[PDB]
Amino acid sequence: THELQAMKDKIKENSEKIKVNKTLPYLVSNVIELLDVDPNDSQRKGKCAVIKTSTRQTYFLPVIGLVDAEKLKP
Amino acid sequence: TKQYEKSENDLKALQSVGQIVGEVLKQLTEEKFIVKATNGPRYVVGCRRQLDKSKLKPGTRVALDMTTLTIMRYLPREVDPLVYNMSHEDPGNVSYSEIGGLSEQIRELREVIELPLTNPELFQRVGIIPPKGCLLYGPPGTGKTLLARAVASQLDCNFLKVVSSSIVDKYIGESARLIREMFNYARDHQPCIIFMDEIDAIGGRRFSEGTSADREIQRTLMELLNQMDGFDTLHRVKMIMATNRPDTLDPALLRPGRLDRKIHIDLPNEQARLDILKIHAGPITKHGEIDYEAIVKLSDGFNGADLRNVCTEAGMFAIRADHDFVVQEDFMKAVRKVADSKKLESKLDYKPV
Amino acid sequence: AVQKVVVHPLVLLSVVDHFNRIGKVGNQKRVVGVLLGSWQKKVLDVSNSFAVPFDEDDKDDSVWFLDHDYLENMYGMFKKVNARERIVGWYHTGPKLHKNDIAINELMKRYCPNSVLVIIDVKPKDLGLPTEAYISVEEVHDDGTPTSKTFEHVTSEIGAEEAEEVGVEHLLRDIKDTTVGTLSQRITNQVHGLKGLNSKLLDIRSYLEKVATGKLPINHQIIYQLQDVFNLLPDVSLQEFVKAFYLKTNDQMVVVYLASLIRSVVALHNLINNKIANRDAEKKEG
Amino acid sequence: QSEQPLQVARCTKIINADSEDPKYIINVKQFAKFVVDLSDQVAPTDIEEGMRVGVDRNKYQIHIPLPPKIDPTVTMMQVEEKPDVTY
Numbered sequence: 001t002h003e004l005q006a007m008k009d010k011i012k013e014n015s016e017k018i019k020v021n022k023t024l025p026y027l028v029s030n031v032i033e034l035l036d037v038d039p040n041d042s043q044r045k046g047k048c049a050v051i052k053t054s055t056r057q058t059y060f061l062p063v064i065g066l067v068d069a070e071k072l073k074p
Numbered sequence: 075t076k077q078y079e080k081s082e083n084d085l086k087a088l089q090s091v092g093q094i095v096g097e098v099l100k101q102l103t104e105e106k107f108i109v110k111a112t113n114g115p116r117y118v119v120g121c122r123r124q125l126d127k128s129k130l131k132p133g134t135r136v137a138l139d140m141t142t143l144t145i146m147r148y149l150p151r152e153v154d155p156l157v158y159n160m161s162h163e164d165p166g167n168v169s170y171s172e173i174g175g176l177s178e179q180i181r182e183l184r185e186v187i188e189l190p191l192t193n194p195e196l197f198q199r200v201g202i203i204p205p206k207g208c209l210l211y212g213p214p215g216t217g218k219t220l221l222a223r224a225v226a227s228q229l230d231c232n233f234l235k236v237v238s239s240s241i242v243d244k245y246i247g248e249s250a251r252l253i254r255e256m257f258n259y260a261r262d263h264q265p266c267i268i269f270m271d272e273i274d275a276i277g278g279r280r281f282s283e284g285t286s287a288d289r290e291i292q293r294t295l296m297e298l299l300n301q302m303d304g305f306d307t308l309h310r311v312k313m314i315m316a317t318n319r320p321d322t323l324d325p326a327l328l329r330p331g332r333l334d335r336k337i338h339i340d341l342p343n344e345q346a347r348l349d350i351l352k353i354h355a356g357p358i359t360k361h362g363e364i365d366y367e368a369i370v371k372l373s374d375g376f377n378g379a380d381l382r383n384v385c386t387e388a389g390m391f392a393i394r395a396d397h398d399f400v401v402q403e404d405f406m407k408a409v410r411k412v413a414d415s416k417k418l419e420s421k422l423d424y425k426p427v
Numbered sequence: 428a429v430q431k432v433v434v435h436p437l438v439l440l441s442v443v444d445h446f447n448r449i450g451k452v453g454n455q456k457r458v459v460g461v462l463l464g465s466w467q468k469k470v471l472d473v474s475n476s477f478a479v480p481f482d483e484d485d486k487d488d489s490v491w492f493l494d495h496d497y498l499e500n501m502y503g504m505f506k507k508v509n510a511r512e513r514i515v516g517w518y519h520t521g522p523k524l525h526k527n528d529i530a531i532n533e534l535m536k537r538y539c540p541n542s543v544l545v546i547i548d549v550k551p552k553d554l555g556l557p558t559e560a561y562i563s564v565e566e567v568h569d570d571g572t573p574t575s576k577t578f579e580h581v582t583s584e585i586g587a588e589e590a591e592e593v594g595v596e597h598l599l600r601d602i603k604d605t606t607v608g609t610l611s612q613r614i615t616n617q618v619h620g621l622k623g624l625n626s627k628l629l630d631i632r633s634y635l636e637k638v639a640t641g642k643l644p645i646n647h648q649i650i651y652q653l654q655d656v657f658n659l660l661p662d663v664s665l666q667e668f669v670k671a672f673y674l675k676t677n678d679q680m681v682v683v684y685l686a687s688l689i690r691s692v693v694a695l696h697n698l699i700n701n702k703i704a705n706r707d708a709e710k711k712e713g
Numbered sequence: 714q715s716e717q718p719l720q721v722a723r724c725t726k727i728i729n730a731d732s733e734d735p736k737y738i739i740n741v742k743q744f745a746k747f748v749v750d751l752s753d754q755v756a757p758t759d760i761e762e763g764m765r766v767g768v769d770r771n772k773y774q775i776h777i778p779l780p781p782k783i784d785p786t787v788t789m790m791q792v793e794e795k796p797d798v799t800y
């Protein structure tokens with residue numbers, strides 16, 4: 001029952017890694033949002049998201065990471 | 075405590091880098107598929123082992139690895155602007171009856187739009203081709219924008235408004251493609267409806283050509299033509315068009331097809347203006363003394379908003395006295411006198427057809 | 428459960444170089460460490476690992492212990508640097524497991540749902556692909572005895588991905604590669620054939636030796652059924668096996684016919700063109 | 714020897730907003746837009762919004778703000794100096 005402080009230490013150490021890898025906001029970007037899951041054709045789970053950039057590029061990424069689909073539509 | 079570690083384990087999945095978007099162009103062999111980055115370099119890579127090329131096909135939006143660039147995951151359809159043109163909402167519905175006149179403007183547009191949707195058999199019963207669009211114009215009288223706005227939430231079904239402004243897109247005004255990019259979901263979400271205000275300034279003539287910003291205009295027009303010039307059937311989309319004048323559009327638009335029907339508004343009759351004041355006099359409560367024809371016979375040759383706003387302005391001009399309820403006395407003065415000032419700039423409002 | 432495991436040369440060397448670690452100080456027993464596996468699917472893959480100091484008394488041949496702080500924070504080290512890596516079990520150098528190796532897996536079953544133990548071999552001798560794989564499972568028995576754990580053998584294969592291929596493929600510097608079609612298949616006919624001879628030979632030598640010495644059980648159980656599976660197919664003709672003979676003869680027809688066709692094409696082109704350029708070079712220069 | 718320090722001060726970049734003390738977002742004409750921090754030599758209250766600044770584009774720090782913006786030599790043609798032709 002005393003391991004709650006130990007888990008508090010591992011979430012402080014890993015959130016310290018969230019302080020060094022947030023991962024930091026630097027480059028400005030814009031979003032494109034969608035929901036997906038992969039049946040095959042074995043079965044797995046997950047979700048994806050899309051993004052814009054300041055360099056005009058676009059990327060296909062497993063769902064953010066860090067904050068979630070909570071907000072927003074892009 | 076445990077949920078925080080869950081968000082930590084969430085972050086243990088996030089160090090994995092996001093892949094690169096891709097469009098599968100065509101294919102060569104099972105290890106080689108023509109693909110291009112959004113920035114233009116074309117590649118041929120291998121797939122992952124779960125997929126069949128029936129799950130890919132040429133001309134398919136996909137994703138690639140960040141190093142091997144291998145085909146892994148995908149989504150068929152995406153875009154930014156589409157749904158964000160949907161969300162404008164008009165109170166009514168019942169605003170249908172709140173536009174006052176006019177019947178053959180009101181009623182015919184129902185037969186022009188509604189019945190095509192529900193009963194295309196009644197088109198093939200006679201054999202007539204379905205009208206795929208509609209056109210308003212003006213502004214004698216007014217209401218071209220609200221009657222649209224009203225019918226959108228009235229007719230219900232699916233409708234998507236086209237904001238006429240941002241299309242120019244600053245750099246590289248090629249955004250006529252976005253109409254296809256919008257038409258593609260109009261072929262997906264079909265049926266769906268489109269209102270367009272201001273087709274005239276995007277109706278550029280290239281009459282006597284000049285400078286630069288006209289060239290991007292006329293080019294953005296060529297697609298609008300070809301999109302309706304198909305090679306395609308847009309019938310499940312209903313294109314509604316209204317603007318200042320139906321003149322500069324050049325004859326390409328002015329023919330049916332692109333412009334399916336001729337509908338417009340004129341100065342509402344004082345008989346119909348008698349009704350336009352009711353929907354103005356409804357939301358305002360006063361002392362019970364009213365003669366509707368008084369303002370109708372005094373105030374003459376106006377528009378619904380012009381009447382209403384000044385009628386409300388009269389109530390606002392009359393409430394300047396700080397008293398609450400106001401008889402038409404002030405209104406038989408204010409609306410009379412105030413609109414006289416408003417009819418000073420009624421000059422030069424009469425435009426070609 | 429676990430069907431087959433993929434053992435890279437990196438984990439094997441990671442045990443053997445630790446056999447140099449405690450081998451220079453010696454002496455007896457074996458090299459035991461914690462296995463880091465990667466499970467993408469029913470087929471198991473192995474990438475990295477780490478070894479922990481281990482000692483086992485003989486007195487008391489059933490006494491064993493490992494350092495959990497080493498397993499804990501180093502897993503915290505390797506999971507940190509690589510989030511894909513996790514412990515799928517443990518390993519030891521054998522060569523033959525003593526009966527005490529079961530409880531090691533039973534202790535680390537709290538870490539992983541199923542811990543597969545990998546016996547390895549530091550000194551290559553016989554008979555073939557080294558090491559071994561045993562998965563922890565409860566098979567009970569057909570005799571209805573109280574449930575006991577006899578580890579089932581998991582087939583092990585050697586593979587790599589990219590960089591682990593780069594290192595060893597340059598490190599061979601020994602024998603010709605492959606070469607495809609000539610020496611390859613026939614040396615495999617020697618190895619797989621002859622190592623298959625002495626395999627079942629020594630294995631049938633154990634079949635009779637276990638009946639001669641080592642009873643009980645020993646014999647039972649699987650002896651009668653397994654040996655009858657050996658007696659399933661003798662298997663000779665008559666009849667249809669005679670039909671397969673000249674049918675196989677009819678199969679070699681086409682390929683050897685094609686062989687004579689390549690002979691005519693290769694002889695035509697090469698001989699004609701060479702004699703042309705030969706007689707021409709001689710008559711023009713001479 | 715004086716080259717290595719201050720040489721990476723590229724690129725001249727205008728800022729956008731500062732939500733709180735540590736954070737800034739800066740925007741350039743290279744198309745690079747970044748929400749990024751400062752070098753400790755720069756105080757928060759001494760800086761203006763939409764201000765051309767120097768930056769080390771590796772960290773994307775705040776090196777120094779530069780007042781000038783536009784305009785090219787048509788100014789320096791229009792802008793004139795020196796005396797002559799007195800009373």
Ligand SMILES: Nc1ncnc2c1ncn2[C@@H]1O[C@H](COP(=O)(O)OP(=O)(O)O)[C@@H](O)[C@H]1O
Pocket residue numbers: 172173174212213215216217218219220221350377378379380382
């Ligand atoms: N009875 C009415 N009440 C309020 N607004 C009205 C009424 N009748 C017409 N309108 C206005 O007229 C607008 C469309 O006319 P438009 O041509 O855009 O105006 P204008 O003639 O001033 O250019 C509608 O958006 C609507 O707001």
Ligand SMILES: Nc1ncnc2c1ncn2[C@@H]1O[C@H](COP(=O)(O)OP(=O)(O)O)[C@@H](O)[C@H]1O
Pocket residue numbers: 299302303304326329330331332
């Ligand atoms: N058989 C026909 N003969 C002449 N015009 C037609 C015929 N069928 C359709 N049209 C009209 O031609 C228009 C499309 O013609 P198209 O050649 O694509 O336009 P554009 O010549 O501007 O490229 C439609 O609006 C339609 O009204």
